[PDB]
């Protein structure tokens, strides 16, 4: 039951991409993918139950070593702890519904089976990454999910914008991966082994934490690395949902939680800055997908702050990930359903009424919005309040800035989420498309997401939920009031006169433009200078005419 | 200020494109079409206050000021229909252009499919 | 119309009739809207292969399982694995293979 959690999606994806798929068709490919996802999900549920509740960690010898030269020893070995069990359970539960939705959304796509196979590869490599006991397998999972994301974003190879976005994201993640590789070099040189269980550190040389955090921020799309995330909406809805729910974006935070070898000051500063930037970004746009992506970034920043707080903060951050994934995927899927009912319209300004879409999709979007904004007694409510309370008691004076920033960010989160729902349904109709699709499978996927959200409340992620921390009565009620304020302001749907601030905010602070010409055009010029001026010039040896 | 091609437009056409793009931008800054309606009425009325202008110097002044106002107000995220230029649904999956097929190439001219030297 | 076209299958009913896709391309996955005739029998055979490989990896997984500490309570892994050590509770009392308190302190 243990190795079923990893090998089964991989085998399913291999079959879906094998020449065997020629003899099956899209019907058969969908059947195979759904069956593989369900079986892996059952295995993951069993493993989660046993590990979390009965505390049984199991280590696996899989393929022997991978390579052992010198004191460096690398082995195909898998270990399942509480962290690995949580990650596997979350990823499988997300990706099962993601596959269910993708089996219906792209029904009129020509090459559906390739899409299914790449999704299965993405899920399997995520399972590989989380199953890692040593850092090399973590790297393998990192690059495998990167490759799968590259293929999935560039699925529609006929649109240049998607190709540009994929290449940009790949290069940014490769910068992060070089930083991570340098950190791995340092970790092995100063610790002599790669298994996380053999990594217990009290005070490193600083570069360890710095480089590891930079590499993690690369995957988590934090400050100075978030630009790629918005452009990823060029890909199909299932890819964005899977990436933003439980994979890729989660991997950096997962590595940080597994390691717990960071530096609190830099972690807190980066997380707070990224959260504030994501919050101000999400309320200032009109593309539906970009807002949800920026919300993903904001929750990533929340988790960063939590893990920077401490070990308890790290576990709370892991629980925040576990609760965030479900409703993030739910929001993505509901947005995709509404968009398809809107004739592919991906802009908010042409929506309205209760005629374009089904009742279940509307209710699912409502529930996901309520959970994400921290509505009292809900899934995101518990994790967000726990992180806030643990951040309202930190011993770092730096954290005081972070607490205020996160309060503002949560208020803005409620603001733009309520604006999203308001523009989706509450406003009058202002588009031209009504094709309400009421197919069983995506509705069932939404149902599974909502059931998992219910479980996350009826059953806590860890023992932290319910652990009461002693705050003044106003302090606890503060995020509730902030969400109420966001509700009021968004239901007013009002705006300001300071239009220069508006044009600045909408531009995403010009970060893409800044990176367009500070490093990039100079890289191009350095390349031309090197080649032409040196090789054909200074390094050139001409001909002796005669 | 407009672009050089728009600078070459006839006065009637220049003002027409000005008004059209202004309506486009007002949609782009609009929360909804319903919000856009009174803005559309006001924008139509404002031009109605300039219908009987004859002195070309003041006409050019008004046109240039409006062009500068519009240029200052180029929307960063325009509202586009999905299957047109710049739209998200544009250039997704086109029909395959005709491509000729070569049957059994290895079978032709065997033992002589290498490289000259 | 060329000679080899007669060996070629037509465009599938799933495919949009207004689309042309140069049907002669051998694709690794099947191509465009691929939907064979005996597809359900192929699907059943594929599921059979899936189940056989599932059984093989199930056997290997049960074979190569290493449990370094007694679990905290009853688990379903017992019913198919005997290498699983007998559980020990939070209070350190050893418990039977059924995960219940033994005699002397039970009931």
């Amino acid at each position: 039951m243990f190795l079923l959690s990893v090998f089964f999606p991989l085998l399913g994806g291999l079959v879906n991409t094998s020449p065997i798929a020629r003899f099956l068709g899209h019907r058969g490919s969908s059947i195979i993918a759904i069956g593989c996802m369900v079986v892996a999900f059952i295995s993951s549920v069993v493993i989660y139950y046993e590990v979390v509740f009965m505390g049984c960690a199991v280590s696996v010898d899989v393929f022997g070593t991978w390579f052992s030269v010198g004191t460096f020893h690398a082995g195909w070995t898998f270990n399942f702890d509480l962290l690995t069990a949580n990650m596997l359970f979350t990823v499988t539960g997300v990706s099962m519904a993601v596959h269910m939705y993708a089996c219906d959304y792209m029904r009129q796509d020509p090459h559906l089976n390739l899409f299914l196979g790449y999704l299965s590869y993405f899920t399997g490599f995520m399972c590989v990454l989380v199953a890692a006991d040593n850092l090399l397998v973590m790297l393998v999972g990192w690059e495998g999910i990167g490759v799968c994301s590259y293929l999935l974003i560039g699925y529609w190879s006929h649109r240049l914008s998607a190709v540009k976005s994929a290449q940009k994201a790949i290069l940014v993640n490769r910068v992060s991966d070089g930083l991570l590789m340098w950190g791995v070099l340092w970790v092995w040189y100063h610790l002599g082994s790669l298994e996380y269980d053999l990594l217990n550190v009290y005070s490193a040389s600083g570069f360890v934490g710095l480089s590891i955090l930079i590499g993690a921020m690369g995957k988590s799309a934090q400050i100075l690395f978030h630009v790629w995330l918005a452009d990823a909406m060029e890909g199909p809805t299932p890819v964005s949902a899977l990436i933003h729910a439980a994979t890729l974006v989660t991997a950096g935070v997962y590595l940080l939680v597994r390691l717990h070898i960071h530096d609190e000051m830099f972690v807190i500063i980066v997380g707070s800055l990224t959260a504030f930037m994501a919050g101000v970004f999400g309320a200032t746009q009109s593309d539906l997908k970009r807002v949800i992506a920026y919300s993903t970034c904001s929750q990533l920043g929340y988790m960063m702050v939590s893990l920077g707080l401490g070990e308890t903060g790290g576990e709370a951050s892991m629980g925040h990930l576990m609760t965030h994934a479900s409703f993030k995927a739910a929001l993505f899927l509901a947005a995709g359903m509404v968009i398809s009912g809107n004739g592919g319209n991906q802009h908010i300004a042409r929506y309205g009424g209760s005629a374009h879409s089904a009742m279940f999709t509307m209710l699912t979007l409502m529930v996901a919005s309520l959970s994400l904004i921290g509505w009292p007694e809900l899934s995101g409510f518990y994790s967000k309040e726990t992180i806030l309370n643990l951040a309202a008691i930190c011993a770092d004076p730096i954290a005081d800035v972070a607490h205020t920033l996160l309060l503002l960010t949560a208020m803005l989160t409620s603001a733009y989420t309520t604006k999203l729902f308001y523009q989706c349904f509450m406003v009058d109709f202002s588009g031209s498309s009504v094709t309400p699709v009421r197919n069983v499978l995506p509705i069932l996927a939404m149902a599974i997401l909502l059931l998992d959200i219910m479980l996350k409340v009826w059953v806590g992620t860890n023992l932290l939920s319910g652990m009461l921390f002693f705050l003044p009565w106003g302090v606890k009620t503060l995020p509730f009031g902030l969400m109420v304020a966001g509700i009021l302001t968004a239901t007013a749907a009002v705006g300001s006169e300071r239009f220069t601030l508006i044009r600045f905010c909408g531009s995403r602070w010009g970060f893409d433009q800044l990176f367009a010409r500070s490093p990039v055009n100079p890289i191009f010029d350095l390349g031309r200078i090197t080649w032409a001026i040196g090789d054909r010039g200074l390094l050139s040896v001409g001909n002796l005419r005669a | 200020m407009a672009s050089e091609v728009v600078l070459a437009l006839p006065h009637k056409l220049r003002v027409m494109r000005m008004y059209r793009t202004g309506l486009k931008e007002l949609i782009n800054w609009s929360a909804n079409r319903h919000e856009w309606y009174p803005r559309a009425y006001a924008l139509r009325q404002e031009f109605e206050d300039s219908k009987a202008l004859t002195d070309r110097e003041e006409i050019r002044k008004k046109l240039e000021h409006g062009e500068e106002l519009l240029a200052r107000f180029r929307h960063w995220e325009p509202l586009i229909k999905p299957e047109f230029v710049g739209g998200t649904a544009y250039s997704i999956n086109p029909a395959q252009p005709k491509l000729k097929f070569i049957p059994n190439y290895d079978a032709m001219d065997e033992y002589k499919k290498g490289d000259h030297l | 119309e060329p000679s080899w076209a007669k060996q070629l299958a037509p465009k599938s009913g799933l495919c949009p009739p207004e689309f042309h896709y140069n049907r002669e391309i051998w694709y690794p996955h099947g191509g465009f809207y691929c939907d064979p005739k005996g597809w359900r029998k192929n699907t059943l055979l594929t599921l059979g292969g899936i189940g056989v490989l599932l059984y093989m990896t199930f056997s290997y997984s049960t074979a190569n399982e290493v449990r370094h500490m007694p679990p905290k309570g009853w688990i379903p892994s017992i019913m198919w694995n005997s290498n699983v050590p007998d559980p020990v509770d939070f209070r350190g009392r050893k418990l039977n293979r059924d995960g219940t308190l033994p005699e002397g302190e039970s009931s």
Partner: peptide
Amino acid sequence: YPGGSFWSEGTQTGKNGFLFGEVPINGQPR
């Protein structure tokens, strides 16, 4: 959906593409 159901008869017989571009001739083995 063909036949109006997800469990309908198939629609494809013949050769789906030419592997390597090798085309059968008069039923003679390649």
